[PDB]
Symmetry: D2
Subunit: 237 residues, 4 copies
């Protein structure tokens, strides 16, 4: 059904489906079983920043995640996205909790997409930046338990009144407009995405993670994708 | 029904509904009868550029239109748009022909919107730029006779195969995503729009014009708004 | 000698040279005696944000200053800058202390300048953004007591080791490259500047203020402009 | 003496110093003998566009050159620029003619540089765009025979009144402000440059080419670098 390309910030090690034995960042190409991962020294309760870049000349999806005063983690994977995704896609953020939980709060999110064609100066571009989310954010499609406006933040999974994260939750937020990522006369297509997040758990084992993803425009949350499947995949294949 | 704020590039003088006796640029606030106009030395067959700017501190909508090697025309009007429009709007381009006609071709269009709130650095922004339109432009809502892809251009009104403009035509193109133009904690909201066009008529009296407009998100073409009403207003009141 | 256009964030009321009896924001056109001022509820020790905008169609210089959780102050003045400044200028930040003092710390500064000419799509632009200053910032010209790198901030006036502001200090920082603000074929010239600051004093009466300014490219600090003259004017005329 | 990293658009095949037997685009790292080249189907008298991209996560310098209605040429090379260049550099365009000649006209040039550090949202950026050059362009350092203003274009090598290119010419234009390309707390540094050019020769064998380059801030034209050395290298080593 959906075609998903995602960069996951995976907080819980599910070693039975291929995760390493630690928090990690990974690049998922149509499967929760990451094609490449890197150890991520996740900091509970601290605001982090994730940067994702890609361009059609090099065909390498790379992501860098860091916390203030700390060294960053980075992961890269050679993949030609024109061979994986459709030419029109929607970009979004997804997150889940299962038996273990954590808040999956997004404080800001920016995305820039550029298609430069061969006609002298023909640049088509799309850029959006949210540094504050309001209760009725009409340019975002919120799916599942995701909500906006609480402290001007985007809460991808359920948090009850007293600030506590709830288990078995799943929510996604996609930018309203389709994004054009390939066109026959384009000589270079590129995108850059940045988002700051705050993962906080009252427990020693937070779960499950946050993922930036790109999908077919009509993507919806697969049934049963709470927990380890990050609201993105229908199974662990 | 719709709330329309528009900058018109009016090619035909309908003196019975208040137009001056020449081509002109005007600022229309919920009525085809422009609140302010300026003489426009329209050049048949030449590519022109229109720039529209506005910000919530000054509350002045201003537009400048020019052709290469020619002096420009400019018109300004003091209007507080928070008192006219909703906080969520869609922006677009509209054009029509009636008994007289002209092609209403758009070669490029860019728009930037910014809402800066009082939280240190809280800037929400939206920017899109089209320098080429493809046949299935999924991020544009095309209404009426508007079509994209012909020579990579956006044709707002019908043009038959041999390049000829057809009379009694009306078409509009709106960017897919809603635009947020007011928010309770914003200290300055501003937008800037730019578009290049090519109006060409085989006749001495081209009609009717092109207009950049901002409307309620669900705006559609009013019945009978071909001709002098520019695909924007239901009557000449 | 220099031609100065500045937006001042004046913390000390010098009623003998025309200040109102409170902290205020003012627009200074070649004189410390502001052409227009607005009361500013200055918050000692809090990080504030100042936004300055202007465009050649409207000819209105406007500034908005705000603190988180507080209402903002705004001041506007109709002035045609092509009649005041040269076509090539340098932009900068200035600050001083006299018998009373305060820290004049800049945490970030961005500036965007655009000159759109009548040649279809001819846009010349300049944009810089500093969210962190390093000890050897080669793209800034630092004058007087200004220094960069201390906590990644720009300190316009002297602060001694223990974090204390020193009196009788004056410092300015200008972006290295000249900025083009007028050109014969330009149909609209515009700029936007934003900077966040932290004014902190151990005293009940902080002095003297911070100012964003635009000057002739070779501007230097006038002799004796500590205190009330903000490192910008040679006298109080 | 200078440290040069350059992308050359080489119009003349000097097979004795390693050029292939055709026009080509190459990546030069401190030597005119390109580390990697790709065949370039150069079109005499047509306006072309060159795009150069690089980021510190991937460490790959890539360039794409194309002409309207034609397939593009692309070349890539894995190189860590932090190991080659200083942290502060100047970027520019260079061109030369020797016994064979061609005009080396630049019609537009844009550059964007970004340093994202690990402090949440700490983005330092620099962007400039020239779509028109004036006779006294104060933000450009012109070296050798380079001049601006002729038809609003930048002429890197001498062209006599009647529009004819002169042999044995060399000229360079660098943006005035230093560019910061590395900083100790940066997690991703990236740049993108774009320029459109018009190479025209009355002869069947045009020479010598145009190059986009990055150098130490005080770089000047090496003695005797007309011809095959592109105004960049002192010898053919
Ligand atoms: Ca997992
Ligand atoms: Ca009319
Ligand atoms: Ca004062
Ligand atoms: Ca050669
Ligand atoms: Ni994983
Ligand atoms: Ni009219
Ligand atoms: Ni004052
Ligand atoms: Ni070569």
């Amino acid at each position: 059904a959906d075609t998903i390309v995602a960069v996951e910030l995976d907080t819980y090690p599910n070693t039975d489906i291929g995760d390493p034995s630690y928090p990690h960042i990974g690049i998922d190409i149509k499967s929760v079983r990451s094609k490449k991962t890197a150890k991520w020294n996740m900091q509970n309760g601290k605001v982090g920043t994730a940067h994702i870049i890609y361009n059609s000349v090099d065909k390498r999806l790379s992501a860098v995640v860091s916390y203030p005063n700390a060294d960053s983690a980075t992961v890269s994977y050679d993949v030609d996205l024109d061979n994986v995704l459709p030419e029109w896609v929607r970009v979004g953020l997804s997150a889940s909790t299962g038996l273990y939980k954590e808040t999956n709060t997004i404080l800001s999110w920016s995305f820039t997409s550029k298609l430069k064609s061969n006609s002298t100066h023909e640049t088509n571009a799309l850029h959006f930046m949210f540094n504050q989310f309001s209760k009725d954010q009409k340019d975002l499609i919120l799916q599942g338990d995701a909500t906006t406006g609480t402290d001007g933040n985007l809460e991808l999974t359920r948090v009850s009144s007293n600030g506590s994260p709830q288990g078995s939750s799943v929510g996604r937020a996609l930018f309203y407009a389709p994004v054009h990522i390939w066109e026959s006369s384009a000589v270079v297509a590129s995108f850059e995405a940045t988002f700051t997040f705050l993962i906080k758990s009252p427990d020693s084992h937070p779960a499950d993670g946050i993922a930036f993803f790109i999908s077919n425009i009509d993507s919806s949350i697969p049934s049963g994708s709470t927990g380890r499947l990050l609201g993105l995949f229908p199974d662990a294949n």
